[PDB]
């Protein structure tokens, strides 16, 4: 699982597509990360696809928030499906979002 959120800090979102997050490696010192979702996630009927891209591409208002008591980096944003009407589309970037020494990487 993307346990990153848990072991990383400063996590949030810019424009919509911009990942920044502290991991650390192991050593007990922190690794300044970022991963674009751009080009790692998509839209699937309106919904949010590990592994795609050009997600925001028919998104609007795309933005990360916290939901849980465990707080879990969650990203929300009306996405436009192919079938027709855009509907809110949420994803959790835990769900497949890792940090390798440190660095953001995704889980496949």
Request: hydrophobic share 30%; charged share 20%; aromatic share 8%.
């Amino acid at each position: 699982m993307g346990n990153f959120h848990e072991s990383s800090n400063n996590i949030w979102l810019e424009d919509g597509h911009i990942l920044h997050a502290e991991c650390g490696n192991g050593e007990g010192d922190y690794v300044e990360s970022t991963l674009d979702l751009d080009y790692y996630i998509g839209n699937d009927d309106g919904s949010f696809s590990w592994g795609g891209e050009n997600f925001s591409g028919s998104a609007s208002n795309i933005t990360l928030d916290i939901e849980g008591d465990d707080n879990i980096p969650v990203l929300r944003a009306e996405l436009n499906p192919m079938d027709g009407d855009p509907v809110e589309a949420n994803v959790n970037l835990s769900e497949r979002i890792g940090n390798d020494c440190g660095t953001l990487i995704f889980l496949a």
